[PDB]
Amino acid sequence: LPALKLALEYIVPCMNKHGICVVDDFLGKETGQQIGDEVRALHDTGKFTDGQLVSQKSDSSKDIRGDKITWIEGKEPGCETIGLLMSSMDDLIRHCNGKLGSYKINGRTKAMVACYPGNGTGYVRHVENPNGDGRCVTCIYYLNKDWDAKVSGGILRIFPEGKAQFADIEPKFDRLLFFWSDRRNPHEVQPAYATRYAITVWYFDADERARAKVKYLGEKG
Ligand SMILES: O=C(O)CNC(=O)c1nc(Cl)c2ccccc2c1O
Ligand SMILES: [Mn+2]
Numbered sequence: 767l768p769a770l771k772l773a774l775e776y777i778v779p780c781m782n783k784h785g786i787c788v789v790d791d792f793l794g795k796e797t798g799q800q801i802g803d804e805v806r807a808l809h810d811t812g813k814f815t816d817g818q819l820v821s822q823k824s825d826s827s828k829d830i831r832g833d834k835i836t837w838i839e840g841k842e843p844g845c846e847t848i849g850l851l852m853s854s855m856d857d858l859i860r861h862c863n864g865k866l867g868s869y870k871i872n873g874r875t876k877a878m879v880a881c882y883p884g885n886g887t888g889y890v891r892h893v894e895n896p897n898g899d900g901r902c903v904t905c906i907y908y909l910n911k912d913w914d915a916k917v918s919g920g921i922l923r924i925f926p927e928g929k930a931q932f933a934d935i936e937p938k939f940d941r942l943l944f945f946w947s948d949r950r951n952p953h954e955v956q957p958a959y960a961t962r963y964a965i966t967v968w969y970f971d972a973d974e975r976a977r978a979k980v981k982y983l984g985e986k987g
Contacts, residue, residue, distance in 0.1 A: 769854070773861035777944060781866055781903075785950050786924060786933055789942040792907065793854065798940040800847040802909045805879055805963050807844060808836055814881055832887030833955075838877040838965075848965065852877055855905050855942075855967055867946075869902045872972040879965050882920060882958040889955035891925070894947035894968070900975030901947040901968040908937040909963040920958030924951050937962055 772789065780787035793801070808814065817831030840849025856874065863871050882888065895901040906922075915921045915936050922935040922943070927950045935943060945951045947968060 769857040770861045773858050774865075777858065778862055778865045781862075781944060781946070785926060786945045787943070788935060789944075790938070791940050792942040793851065793940055795940070797847065797850070798909070801851055801907075801965075802911070802939075802963070804844055804847050805881075805909055805965070808838075808879065809834075809881055809963075814879075817883060817887075820887055830885070830887070832882065832885075833889060834881040834883060836879050838879055840877060848877060848879070851907055851965065852967060855907070859903070859905075859969055866903065869971040870973065871902065871969045873970040873975065875901075875968045875970075877965050877967050880963070882955065882962040884918075884958055884960040884962065886919075886957045886959055888920070888957040891952055891954040893949050893952050896949055898974055898978060898981075900970040900978045902971040902974065903969040904943075904945050904947045904951075905967045905969065906943040907965045908941045908943070909939060909965070910937050910960075911939040913938055913960075913962075918958065918960040918962070919956050920960070920962045921956045922953060923956060924953040926951060937964060 777787050777789070792798075814834040814836045817834045820830040820832045822829055838845050838848050840846075840852045859871055859874075894904055913920070913936055920937055922937065924933040924935065924945065926933060935941075945953075
């Protein structure tokens with residue numbers, strides 16, 4: 767699907783109405799698998815961190831660690847297809863710009879590739895950007911073929927503001943997710959009992975980012 771039809775007939779209206787938008791079959795099976803292969807290779811060759819320290823015991827051997835991450839620019843050897851994904855995300859956002867709320871997106875982060883190792887760890891309820899650091903949209907791409915949450919857990923649960931209801935997102939292969947990064951969307955990752963991969967990019971609003979700079983402010987003289 768042209769990034770444009772997707773953006774204009776689905777992503778823009780869905781984001782403006784619900785603040786959450788799920789796109790299935792974003793890149794297709796061949797490309798999705800290549801990205802999966804690239805991410806698994808990063809994992810298998812030790813490029814991820816050891817995982818978030820979840821519980822720290824007096825005996826460090828007993829320490830429990832959770833989500834593992836690596837930061838990817840998309841230009842690294844063996845990361846080209848991740849780079850293609852990132853360029854594809856950028857295309858969608860470009861076609862959305864000026865239509866996602868009143869935001870004007872002018873930049874993004876590198877990609878954060880996350881691996882929940884499947885040891886029953888998840889990610890606590892949180893807001894992405896509670897203090898105004900510039901991020902207005904979170905974009906997540908999932909890689910997990912034939913994921914079944916009834917057996918593997920790992921659901922992303924969002925708690926949209928004002929509503930008495932969940933939004934439960936399975937981390938399905940070739941699924942792309944957008945949601946507002948601010949306090950409108952507190953969310954959590956439920957315990958994952960199988961290896962679970964995702965790739966996240968955050969997009970910046972030009973005005974919020976420009977004034978965030980005042981919080982972390984250098985020329986000599
Ligand atoms: O993976 C998911 O479906 C949802 N993930 C998150 O909400 C999430 N958020 C943050 Cl801020 C971090 C931050 C660091 C590492 C992993 C994270 C994560 O998985
Ligand atoms: Mn998050």
